[PDB]
C-alpha cells in the first residue's frame, strides 16, 4: 500500500518527505487556497510541491466543463511527470478523463462516494480514484465498506485502477485500507505523524536503554 | 462489467454514448414498438442502433419457431457485425442458439428467470444469457439472487458465456451485479444517468468553488 | 455441468441432442426392455442408441460375481467405444473396476449412498461415481449433502472421476448439483423437459409478441 | 407439527387414519375430481371425508367472486364442525377470508407462493396458509426458502395463523419443514407411508428377533 | 408488519381500504400537490382521507420554524384522532417532536436517512420514524440496510418509536422490510396491487377450474 | 441510547435538551475553566450546570491519592444530587469507587482502555465506566471492539454499571456504539449536531417545499 | 464474574478485597505452607483467612480415597461455613463429592482437563468445577476452548455449579474467560494487579495532571 | 486420499490391493508378531510384505536412544526401498529422523497429539506425520481437529510432508479425513470392508435382480 | 514455518539445531551478557553464535540516532554473514533500515505493536518483522490478532518481510502463529523444548515398551 500526504502545506511536505514514508501528495481546491494566502499565490505552492516531491502530485482541475477541464489538465501536466491530474466525477469528468488517458495522461477522479461511481472511473480509464471515506462518516454511514466493495468489484473484473483512499480522518482508516488491500491512502499531517507510534513502542526503547545500561553505563 | 443502454430510443443512445460509458445496447419488440409510431419504422430505427453503437447491439427475433428463428438470427447478423441476435429461453430457443452458434453467429439467450435455464443457454452455446431480475422482484423473489447462482455456475465450469443482467429497475441493482461480479448489466437511460450521480459530489464540488474563488476570484486555474 | 438423458427412446434422445443440452444417456434394462416393442430386438436397441450418440453411454452389468461382470463388461465394450459400462458397488464390483479401468474401458460404479463410498470407486480407477440422491431423500436424508461432501473430497484430491448424479427427482436437485459443480446429471426426459420452463418466460413472450403486432400486423421480421 | 394427508381418496385416507398418524386431511379441486369419476358424486366424497376423519378437513370454494366464495364458505362449513373453508389468495379471497374469520369460520389461504402473499393472507385473518413448495420447486425455485422466510415473519409480528406447507413431494421438503418450525405439513399418501421407515430399523428389527431367538426359541 | 398507502389519490385509498389490507395512509406535500389540481383543494382533500381512513393518516407540516411547526400540528391534531402529524428531521423537528409528544399529539419523523437520525427522533418521543429506503438505492447504498440497523438498535433499547418504512419503490423492499420486522411499510398503490400476485397463483386457479370442470361442467360448487 | 454533552457551555446545554435528545453532561476542569470568561466564577459554572440539568453531570477529581479522591468526591456530591464522580483507573480509584459506591455517590470510571479494566470497575460498584475509544483509534486499534466486548461481558453477568462511551471523534463511533448497544455516548456538542444531517434530508425538504408552493403560493398551512 | 484470588498471603487479600474486586480465595497447600512461617501454624493460616474473607475460601484435601477425602472434608467445613472443599476429578473424588453435597458441604472439583469430566463432576453435586486451562496451553492445546463448551453445557441444562476458571497465566485467559461468562476466575496477586493497567491509562492521568496544573497551578480542587 | 491397511496379514492385503483401494501397508511389533506363527519368522513376515507390496510399509523401530534408532532405520532400509522408518515423536526421534532424512530413508513419525508436533517432524524432515485421532477421542477432545489444523499448517507452508491419519476407530474418522483432505488414512482389514457397504446398495442390489428377472427369467444378460 | 531460539547460549542451539527445528537465533538488549560469565568476552559469544548457526542471527543496535545505527549495523555485518540487525520502530530506525537494506544488510524492526506500524517497516524494505505478542497480551489486548492482521496485509501487498512473532510467551502462541501462517517464531528455549512433549505422546512410549517386551522380552 502507497502512502500519500493529503495537504498544500509545505512545511508539512517538507517534514513528511524527510521522514522517508511519504510516497506522494494529494492537494485539492480547499486545501491550496488555505495557503494561498497574505501574498502567497497559488501557482508557485503547486510548483514548490512539484519540486519536493519525488512522487505522485495530484492537482486538482476548477473548470466544471469538458474542453476547460483538458485544457487545466494539459497545463497541469506539463508542470512536471509526477503531475496527476484530479479530475471530479461528473459527466464532463468521465468524458475528461477518457480523452486525458488516451493521450497518457495520469489522471485522479475525486470526490467518488459509492462503488459504482468508481467502477465508472475506472471504466473511464482513470489511473487513481479517490473515495472520501471521512465525508461518508460525517453523514453516518461507515465510509470504509464503500472501499471494501470497489475493492471486491475492481478484483473481480482485474482492473488496474489503483483505489485510492481520502478523506481520511484516523489511523483506524488507514489499517482497515490496508487489511481490504486498497493500493493507494493519502492522509493529512496528523494522522501521518501518528502511524509509527506506539506506547509500547516507547515503553519498550526506555526499557531496552536501561537494560543496556545495566552492561555498558 | 460493461455497461449496455436498454432503449430503442436514439436520442438517448447517442447521448450515452458520448458520456463513454455504455459498451452496447439491448432492445426487445417492446422497446422497438415505443419507438417506431408517426410513421418510424422498425427497420430504420434497428439499423440506426446498429449504425451508430460500436458495441454489441442485441435485436430479438420475434419467430417462435426454430426455422423462423434461425431466418430473422441471419438477416439480424447480415445488418452488421456488431448485431447480437436475441432468442427467448425455449425449445426452439435453444435449437436455434445451438445451429446458429455452430454458424459463428453471436447470440443473447432473453427471458431468462432462473439459474438453471441460464446454463442451458450456455450449453446450447450462446454468446450472453439475460435474466430479468426486475421482474423476478416483482413477483416477490429477490432477482439478484439468481445472478449470484448463475455466477457460481459459471465459475464453476469455466463458462465462456457472458451473464447479463437485465430489466433492472435502480442503481442497487447495478451495484449488487458489480460485486457479484456479472459480466455485462444494461440499464434503461434514468438509471445509467443516475449513476454518475451523488449528493456528496454534488456538495464538494460547491465547496471547492467556493474556496477556490478566495484565491482566485474569476473561478480559474492559470498556469 | 453435463446432462445425461436417462432413457432409451432414439426419439427422446435425439430431440434433446438438438437442443444442444444432452451429453451422453443413461440406460438399463428395464429402460432398454420398455423400447423393443413392435418387433424391435433389445440389441438393436442399444447398438442404435451407441451409434447414434456421440458421448457417454451407460450400460448396466447383471452379473454379481467378478469373473461375469468383467466378462460382460468387455461384450458391452465391444459394442462401441462410448460405451460405459455400470458397476454396483461391491467387493467384486471394485475388483471389476480395477480390471476393466486397466484394460481401458470406462465404468460408472452405482448404487452409491455415501461419500467414501464415491472415493473407493475412484481409487479403483471408476469412470464415473453415481450416487442416487433421490433414493436417500427417500429415507428422510438430505442425498445432495452427500453430493456436496464428493465434490469436496475429490477437489481435494484432483480427482478424475466425475460425479453423475442419479437418482433426481425434481428441478431443485439439478440446480444444487450445479452449484455444487457436480460434473453430470442423469434426468429422465420429462425433468429435462421442466428444466427449460418458467412463467415468467411464458408471459414474457406473450407481451413481446402482442407488442411486436402494433408495429408488424403478421408478426413479421421483415429486415 | 401436526401431519395431514393431501388427497381426496377414501381408501388412502382410511388407511391413513387407522396408522394414527394423521392429523388432519386437505383436498383442492383436482383432488376431488380424481376420485369423483365412474358415478361417484363430489358432494358424496367430501362428506365421507368429512365424516372419517377427526381433525381439520379443508375443502376449497370454486366461485372466484366474494359473494359466491363467502356462500360457498358457508354452506361448506355447515357441513360439519372440522370442515375448514380452502380460500385462494386472491383479491376477492383476501376479503373472503376477513369476513369468514369475523363470522368465526376457519379459513386456509392457498395457492400462495412468496412470503408476502402469506403475510397478506394472515393479516386478513386466515386460519391457515398454504405455501405450495414442490410447484416453486418444479419452476426452479427452492421452495423451501419461502417456508424459511414466513416462518421468521411470523415469529417476528407473534402471527397465530398456521403455516401450512402444501405441495409436498418428497420425504425432505417435510423434515425441512420440521427443522424451520412450520406448523403443519400436509403430504401426499406416498410419502406419507414412507416417513415411518428407515432401512436399519428393518435391519435392527431382524437383528433383534435374531438374538432373542438364543434365549428363547 | 402494518401496511399503509403512500398517496393522496382518493380512488387509490377507496379501492385499497376495501381489499381490507390497508392499515392507514400515509401524505406528504408532493403527494397532496398531485392532487390539488383542476381546483381541488388541499384541505378537502385531507379532510376527506381523514374522514374515510380508520387507521392513522400522516400529515406533513410546511412550516420549517419550531413555532410555526407546532402551530401547524395543533391543526392537524385537531381535524381527527387518527391525524398524525409528519415533521421533517431537523434541529427545530426534533424541539417540536419533544413538544407535541408531551401533549399526546402522535407525530411521524421524516426524511430519515441513516440509523442514528432515526435514533434522535426516538429519543424525542416521536411515534413513527420514517427512513426513505428508495432514496438511498437512488444514490447507489441498499437503504434497506439501514432498516436493518434501526431494527436492531430499537430492539436492543426497547424503542417503541414505531418503524415506518418509506420510498417503496418494489416488493422486495416489501419483503426484507418484513422479514427484518419493521413495524410499518407505507407503499404505493402500484406496488400494493402487486403484493398479492403471483404467476403460479393465476396458473394454479386456472387448472383448478379446468379440472372442476370435468365433475360440474357449470364450474358450481352445490353443497 | 443516552447522549451526554462533553461541554460545560450552560447554552449548547439548554439547546440540547430542548432537542429531546440529551440526557447529561460530562465535563473536566479544561471544559468549565473555557466557561469562566467575563467574570464568571469556575465554581459557579459547575453549581448551575447542577442545577440546570435534571439527570447526570460528570465532574472530575484531580487527586491521585484515595484519601484526596473520596474527600473530593464528597465535596462534588453535595454540590448536588445528580453530580456523578470521575475517578481514574487506578489502584487508589479502585478503592475510592468502593467506598463512595458504599456511600451512595454515583460515579464514573475513565481512562479505561481495556474490557478487563470495565470489568474491575464495575465489580468495585461504579455508576459509568468510560472507555476511550478515539485515544485507541489514535495508537492503531479500532476502539469500537472493547466496547462490543464489555457490552457482552456485562450482559453476560447482568451488571447494571453502565457502558458511556467517551473520547468520541465521528459519527460512525456514535452508530457502531447504538448497534452494539453501548448505554450512553458523550459527544461534544458539535458531534452532537453533525448527527441530524444528512444532505437528502435537505435536499428532501427543499422539494416538498417547492411542490408546496404549487398549491399555497405563501407556504401556509391552513386548516 | 467473580474474582478469587489464588494464594494465602493475608495481605494480599485484604488488598483485593479493599479494591472492591475479590470475591473469595482458592487455596492450596503450598499457597497456605508459604505463608506458614515465622511462628505462624498452617491451621492458623486457613483459620485467619475464613475469618477475614466475607466469601467462598477453596481448601485442597490430600487423601487420595474416599474415607480419607470426606473425613478431611468435614474437618474443614467445622472451621467455617465458607470453606470450600477441593477435592480431584476421580473415582473416589465425584463419591466424595455426592456424599459431602448431601450434607450441605460445599466442594471444589479440580483437575478438570475436558468439559464431560466437568458435567460428570456437576452431576455429583460440586458447587465449582476448576479446569486448569494453562496446562491445557502447556500441551498445545487452547484451554480456554474447553471453558467455552463446558458454558454452553451448563446453560443447555440450566446447570448451577459454577465454571471456575483455573491455571491462569495471562490476561487473555482473563478477558477471554468473562466474555465467555465463566462464573469465576481464580487468579494470582500479580496477575490480578496486571488487570489494572494500561499504558493509555498512565498517559491519560499524565495529560490529566499537566492540563490542571494549566487551570490551577498547585494542584488542588476547591 | 491415499488408504493404508494396518496390517501385517498378507491374504488381507492382496484382498485389498485387488480391490484397488489400497497404497501402502502399516505394520507394528504387534501386527507383524501376530503372523509370525507356524514357521513363519518375524522377518520373514516384513521381507514377503516388502517384496508383495507396491508401495510403501511402515515399520517400527523399538529403541528409544537416537543410535539404537538409526542403526535400526538403516537396518529396515535394507530390506527395500519401499520399507518406511516409524520414528515416535520424541527428542531423540527428531534427531534421528534428521539423520535419516539426510539420508533419504523414508520415515514416519507416529504418536502425534497436537498440531505443532507435527509441524517438528516435518521441519526435521519426515516423509509422513501420524496423529492418533482415537486416542484423543479417548480423553474427550474430538481428534480430527488436530487433523484440520495440521492441514492447515501444512498448506500455509507448502509443506510435503504426508498427513497418516491413524488410530481410526470408525467410518468418519475416514469421512472427515477426506473432507479434510488428509494424504493418507491408516485403517484395520476390517473397518476397510466396512467403508464398502450401505444398506441401500443392498437395497438396490435386490431391486436389479428382480427387475432383470422380469426382462429376462435365467439371470443372464446376451 | 521458521523457529528461531531467543537465546545466547551455544549448548542450547547445538541441541535445537541437532533436533532439526531450529532455523536460527534472536539475541535483545535485555541474552548475551548472560553467557559472558567466568572467560568468555557482550562479543566472543556473538561471534562464536555467527559461527555455529547455519542461519540467521538477530543482534540489536544500541544507537538511538539514526547514524550511529547505520555504522553500528554495518559493524554487527561486518561479523558474519548470517547477522540480521535489529532496529526498533522508529523515525530514525526506518529511516536506517532503508539505508542499510540498499547496502544489501539483512534487518529485523522490533517492538512492532500493531499492523500499520509493520507495514511501515515493511515499505522500508526490512527483512522481518516483529510484533511482540505477548506484550500486547500483558495490556489486555489478544496480540495473536495483530499476527493474523499482519499475515493479511501482507498478503494482500505480497510482502516479502517476513513476519517474526516475537514476545511468545506459551505454545498457543506457537500454534496461532502456524495456523495464521507467520514465517517465523522466536521462542525461547524452555517454550522450544514442551512444543514437543505431550501426555499421550509419554503414555504411548510406555505402551510400545511394554506390548514389545510381551513379544520379545
Ligand atoms: O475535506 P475532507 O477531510 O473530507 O478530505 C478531503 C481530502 O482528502
Ligand atoms: O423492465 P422490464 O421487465 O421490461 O425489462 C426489460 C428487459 O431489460
Ligand atoms: O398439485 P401439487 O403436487 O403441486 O400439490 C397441490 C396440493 O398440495
Ligand atoms: O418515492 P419517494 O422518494 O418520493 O418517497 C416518498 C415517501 O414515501
Redesign the interface.
Given at each position: 500500500?502507497k502512502?500519500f500526504l493529503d495537504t498544500a502545506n509545505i512545511d508539512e511536505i517538507r517534514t513528511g518527505v524527510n521522514?522517508?514514508?511519504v510516497d506522494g501528495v494529494t492537494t485539492?481546491?480547499?486545501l491550496?487556497?488555505?495557503e494561498?494566502?497574505n501574498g502567497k499565490?497559488?501557482?508557485d505552492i503547486?510548483r514548490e510541491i512539484l519540486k519536493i516531491v519525488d512522487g505522485p502530485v495530484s492537482v486538482?482541475?476548477?473548470?466544471?466543463k469538458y474542453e476547460g477541464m483538458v485544457e487545466?489538465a494539459r497545463?497541469?501536466h506539463?508542470?512536471g511527470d509526477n503531475a496527476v491530474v484530479k479530475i471530479?466525477?461528473?459527466?464532463d469528468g468521465?468524458?475528461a478523463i477518457?480523452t486525458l488517458s488516451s493521450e497518457h495522461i495520469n489522471t485522479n477522479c475525486t470526490?467518488?462516494?459509492?462503488?459504482?461511481?468508481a467502477?465508472?472511473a475506472a471504466?473511464?480509464g482513470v489511473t487513481y480514484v479517490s473515495p472520501?471515506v471521512?465525508?461518508?462518516?460525517?453523514?453516518?454511514?461507515?465510509?470504509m465498506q464503500i472501499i471494501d466493495?470497489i475493492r471486491?468489484?475492481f478484483n473481480?473484473?482485474i482492473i488496474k485502477t489503483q483505489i485510492l483512499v481520502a478523506s481520511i480522518?484516523?489511523?483506524?482508516h488507514?489499517?482497515?485500507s490496508?487489511?481490504?488491500?486498497a493500493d493507494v491512502v493519502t492522509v493529512p499531517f496528523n494522522v501521518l505523524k501518528?502511524?509509527?507510534?506506539?506506547?509500547?513502542?516507547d515503553?519498550?526503547?526506555a526499557?531496552?536503554?536501561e537494560?543496556?545500561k545495566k552492561?555498558?553505563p
Open positions: 500500500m502512502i521522514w522517508g514514508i485539492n481546491p480547499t491550496i487556497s488555505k494561498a494566502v499565490k497559488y501557482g503547486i486538482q482541475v476548477v473548470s466544471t487545466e497545463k497541469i506539463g508542470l471530479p466525477m461528473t459527466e468521465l468524458r477518457k470526490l467518488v462516494f459509492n462503488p459504482i461511481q467502477l465508472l471504466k473511464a472520501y471521512g465525508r461518508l462518516d460525517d453523514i453516518g454511514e461507515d465510509g466493495m471486491t468489484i473481480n473484473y480522518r484516523n489511523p483506524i488507514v489499517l482497515r490496508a487489511v481490504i488491500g501518528s502511524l509509527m507510534k506506539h506506547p509500547k513502542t515503553e519498550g526503547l526499557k531496552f536503554l537494560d543496556w552492561v555498558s
